[PDB]
């Protein structure tokens, strides 16, 4: 995933 923005 990515983080900060686990929703990418």
């Known amino acids: ?3 900060x ?3 990418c």
Do not use: K, M, S, T
Request: with cysteine; glycine share 16%.
């Open 1 to 3: 995933g990515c983080v």
């Open 5 to 7: 923005y686990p929703w």
